[PDB]
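fwd from M.: "can u put these together and see what the complex looks like"

so here's what she sent:
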Amino acid sequence: QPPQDLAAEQSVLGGMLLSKDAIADVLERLRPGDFYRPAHQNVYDAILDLYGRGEPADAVTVAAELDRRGLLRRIGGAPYLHTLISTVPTAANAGYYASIVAEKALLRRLVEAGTRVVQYGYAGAEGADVAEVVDRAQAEIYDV
Amino acid sequence: QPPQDLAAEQSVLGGMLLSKDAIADVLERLRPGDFYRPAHQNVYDAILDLYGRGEPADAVTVAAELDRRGLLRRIGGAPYLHTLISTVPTAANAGYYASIVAEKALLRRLVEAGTRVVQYGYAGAEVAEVVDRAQAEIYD
Amino acid sequence: QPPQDLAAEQSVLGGMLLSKDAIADVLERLRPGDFYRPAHQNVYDAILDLYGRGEPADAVTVAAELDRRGLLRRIGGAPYLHTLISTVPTAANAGYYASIVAEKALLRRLVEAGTRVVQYGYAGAEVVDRAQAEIYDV
Amino acid sequence: QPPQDLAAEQSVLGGMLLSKDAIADVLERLRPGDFYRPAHQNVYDAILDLYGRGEPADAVTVAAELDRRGLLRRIGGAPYLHTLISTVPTAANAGYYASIVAEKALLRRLVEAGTRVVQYGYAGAEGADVAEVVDRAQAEIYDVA
Amino acid sequence: RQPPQDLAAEQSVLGGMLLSKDAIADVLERLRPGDFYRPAHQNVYDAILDLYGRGEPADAVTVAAELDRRGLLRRIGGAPYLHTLISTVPTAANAGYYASIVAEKALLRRLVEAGTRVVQYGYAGAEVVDRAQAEIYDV
Amino acid sequence: QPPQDLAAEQSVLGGMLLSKDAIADVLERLRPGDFYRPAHQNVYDAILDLYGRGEPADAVTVAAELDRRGLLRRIGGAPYLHTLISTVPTAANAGYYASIVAEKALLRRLVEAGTRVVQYGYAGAVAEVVDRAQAEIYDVA
């Protein structure tokens, strides 16, 4: 089970749906890819799409952005967004929760890179010489 | 499967046991740690200890050096040393065989390093020291 | 199945009930016909009636206006009006919610248009024309 | 079942196989894709292939054009072409029957375009704005109109 | 697999030739007796050409007589089959078009026969390669 | 069974594994694809690979090269290379065996070209079809 904090992911998304100011704080710390759960990445991307267009991102506008993308039934609909809101009182701590999500994502990519390096050792790189295999494995750990 | 090449290892050793020139060509690209078979690392270490003394390293003298270390029986005795000499295609080519051993060793080091990094990632999950150590491991 | 966003409809209505400025924003984007739910169409008409006569349109006064048209029970009464007011995230965003309702209404008119061109096909230039009209009319 | 007239399709093809004047008449009215039955479209396309080349289109030359296309066995061989010819006395009425086939094709394309529009309505804005959804819908009917 | 051929086109060519002297001129430009798949058809074709070459009319009656005197009338299905040929041709003036179908099918059949010989030259074991080339380049 | 000579393929490869000089004799007579068995084509390609960068090509290096390529388990491992060597006393006849392999590869390409021609004749649809069949035999010739 890869490094993750699903509770922190829920709090981040809930905070973002409650406050525009929390979105700016989260953008500071997170990338799309940092969310372990694909549904959470979908929600995050929908929030950012609306925010980047200067449109409000709340339970209603976000559900509609998801639906336009055909993604609403995959997250579990508008009732999931309401569940996300309820994991946090207010959006005050959103940056803090985003820092947990980012730290767990670093660790998870470290684990993924490490397993990829192992895969390089056992299998090489499509017939490449060991020198190339070693350069590729070193870049894997660099890209964390 | 652990990256290794049995015949290349046997052939490096056989070439060395037959030719002092072969030892010079192998020393440049190998450490005893490069051998996957513990018997081979033992035999290699015995050859180099004698070579560092001016003592000719052939099957007989190597057997005596390994016996002295209490390692002769462990490595398969005189009969295994004989297998090594019969195996090498060409003693003059020991350098090429060595490069094969060296490459397999590198690949094995990746498996060990990668495995360590995975462990650090799980340890961190229980971060800056973790990431840095993981990078020490791979760049080494 | 029919394209619709019931939460967006509720939030348009809730915003208008909580804010006079919201009504002005929604007016530029919607027709009563855009609402899927008949109950929402009636609530909307009631707000616009109050508004057009310069009268305050809140939960209480709108209920009074619906009662007079004989529709308060039909739309779900004061409990339902309370639901609308609870549902809207932010009343000042009522225009954004209206855009959503309008977009769904357009998609729904597309389904409706396509369905009737199909019906025209199985019936019978007499039909080609009427069907042509239906989909540029969307 | 989609708007169609199989009897009128047979009569059109029979007429065309009997007379070059009938092919010309039919061409005034029909477009590629107008035949409901795939075997009938294949026969029609083979006749038009020959006619566009200034070659005659009779049972022999058409069976060979179909055979070159690997479609002769698909439709039941030259005996099928002889059956089509037997559906008509002369090729006098070929344009009349083509007008039936064309009307049914118009109506079928309307049914097909309609259901395509419905599909777009339900699967809306997948990639757009909704304007490009509406435009795809209108492009469907332009094709028909 | 069926060797490439079109038996209806073969019948129509011969039918048209029996019905029109101009058709024989048209067909002569496009065919040889060997283009016909059925031996019976080659025999009829040869008879027509022999008559034609002598300035003699070639019709159901005169062709049967030519064939009979060759000892081939019975072999080709008699005077009744000559009637089958004449009733088959959709339009005699289109003989040239039916001949192109027969010519094209004979070309395809020669490819099949040539490819088959080449395969056999492979299994028979510089001489073979030359023979195999000659087979394909003379199709 | 397609024109082939498995024994001569083994003997060619064994000769090449025994003598650098025989690699030159063989490549004088063989082209890519001449081996009937894919494993043999792999072995051959590995030998020329090592040859081209002036490395010795013996049972140890060739095996390592094939392993790099993911092809060693496919030939049966390093012991097969030892079986190939054991198939000939010395590499003296390597050119002779390569000439047999070349010949059979010619006759096999002739068989394949021929069956493709048969397929062109059945496929139909004319002047371009004839030219295709001829390009087929041009390749062999």
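replying to her w this: Residues 58 and 111 of chain B are 34 Å apart (CA to CA).
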